[PDB]
């Protein structure tokens, strides 16, 4: 158990970098351009690597010159691979990401291209036994509840310091995604889905979300410039400041670099407190740097 | 491998990325959204009427510059699946390989582009001396860096001064940004195409206006070609009679992206064909008009 395990998307991010956002039936050229490996879980994978954490990516990609582009990229960060669904049909998904400069928002525009997501039967194949952590972004509902009930079940036949500690992701405010809130150790609702259900802050997201996560977890919501709190057994709200940029002029996967440095901090055996504030500090810089090298 | 002398047509000009995003309703900035399609298209002027001219029967090469990378990759493999020859491209050490962000608002119709960088350097007139010119019989220029350009079209001038008739290469130049440096490339070439958004920016109506208003700019004995849309195209050479097609409009308009490099390729293959610029405008009319009801290239002949 040394390896962190992310299980979700890898996306090929193709990057506009703007001056400003372009009004609708408007002809703006952009300042410069770049090819990113995304995807949530794959940017986490990239963060957990340069914290120095050995970690692996799971999720389905489809041969073909994208791929290549997409595992050259995971090798050349250190990310093992050798988890990875590949898939006879689909085509691998690509998003359009427009980022304003000026106040480093990214729009995105994706192509879900209907690859086969991992499924149970996928997950049923790996050796749980080299994961200290499994990060699990939320999908495909049914079949991750599925995988969940695998790692519990590991959990139970074995002893309290060779546990695999489980975080799972609630980012698209999707009703199906909301039964994973659910599983896990630690928690992550985005501000999103926290607004879609009524809630104008993230201690009134913790308060009211609380009796819908498992006995003993941990749940965390980041809310951008307020920068993020938590909340666990003890009832006792946690919060952190941001860590913003004097310039802010990347946004696009600063939750994927919050995630992967609560992640990091935790399974460093840091409290709740420290990695909300590690996870605000390491997702600040981020921001104020094109895509992820100098965060650390 | 072996091209033989005088046998292809070659295009100077851009190669471009397009990257074709359809969406419900625009998105708004910081937000995430799915397309209802996506499509990664091979674009640009010389690029668009390379296509064309493979389509038509004709060997063909493109010039254009590239950086070494996965966007070049792409541009190449899909310029061989149209059967483009790609010898000549001019790769570059620094800059990006331009890619192009558009995306569609399927309820209105409306198109918003985020238009490739400026990083890539332009084909100069020194990248052009090192072309071995006896394999073309007919080289067309989409007037960019025109300065640059001006002296290609010099060394093509040297090279045929030198050559019987019968060895001579054909020339053709593309003024379509209403761009003041470009307006130079008019007294260049045996073949001048004129965009209807540059004759509308100098203030001309119509076709007509637009040809009896430039014709002084042309070298002498050249053809000055304006396609106007639905109205068709004319050309006027140094006879001074004005020739005329009207318009080959589709059942249904589908996709007229190209449209004015397929009537450039099709009046450009027509001509090295030995067909007449009556001839020539009708079958560009006719070719164009023909693609506007079809999705892309495929079928277009
Ligand atoms: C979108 C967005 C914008 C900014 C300015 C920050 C910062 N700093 C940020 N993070 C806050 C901490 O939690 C992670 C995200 N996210
Ligand atoms: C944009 C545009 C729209 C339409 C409907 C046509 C036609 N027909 C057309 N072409 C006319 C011939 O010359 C080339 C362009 N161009």
């Known amino acids: 158990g040394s390896q962190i395990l992310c299980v979700g998307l890898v996306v090929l991010d193709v990057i506009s970098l703007v001056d400003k956002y372009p009004k609708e039936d408007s002809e703006i050229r952009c300042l410069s351009q770049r090819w990113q490996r995304g995807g949530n879980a794959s940017n986490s994978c990239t963060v957990l690597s340069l914290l120095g954490a050995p970690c692996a990516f799971m999720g389905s990609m489809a041969p073909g010159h994208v791929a290549d582009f997409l595992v050259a990229d995971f090798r050349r960060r250190g990310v093992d ?4 669904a590949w898939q006879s049909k689909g085509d691998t998904p690509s998003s359009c990401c427009i980022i304003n400069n000026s106040n480093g928002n990214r729009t995105i525009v994706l192509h879900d291209t209907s690859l086969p997501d991992v499924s149970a039967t996928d997950f049923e194949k790996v050796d749980l036994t080299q994961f200290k952590w499994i990060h699990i972004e939320g999908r495909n509902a049914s079949e991750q509840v599925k995988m969940l009930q695998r790692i519990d079940a590991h959990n139970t036949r074995q002893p309290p310091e060779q546990k695999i500690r489980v975080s799972v992701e609630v980012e698209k405010p999707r009703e199906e995604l909301f039964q994973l809130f659910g599983y896990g150790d630690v928690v992550f609702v985005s501000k999103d889905v926290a607004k879609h259900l009524g809630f104008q802050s993230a201690e009134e997201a913790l308060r009211g979300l609380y009796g819908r996560v498992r006995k003993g977890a941990v ?4 809310w951008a410039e307020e920068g993020a709190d938590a909340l666990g057994p003890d009832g006792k709200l946690l919060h952190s400041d941001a860590f913003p940029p004097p310039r802010v002029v990347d946004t696009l996967g600063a939750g994927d670099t919050f995630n992967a440095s609560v992640i990091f901090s935790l399974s460093q055996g840091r409290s709740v407190q420290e990695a ?6 390491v997702a600040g810089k981020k921001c104020g740097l094109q895509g992820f090298d100098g965060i650390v």
């Open 81 to 84: 691979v050798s988890q990875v």
């Open 219 to 222: 749940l965390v919501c980041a």
């Open 276 to 281: 909300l504030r590690f996870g605000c500090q």
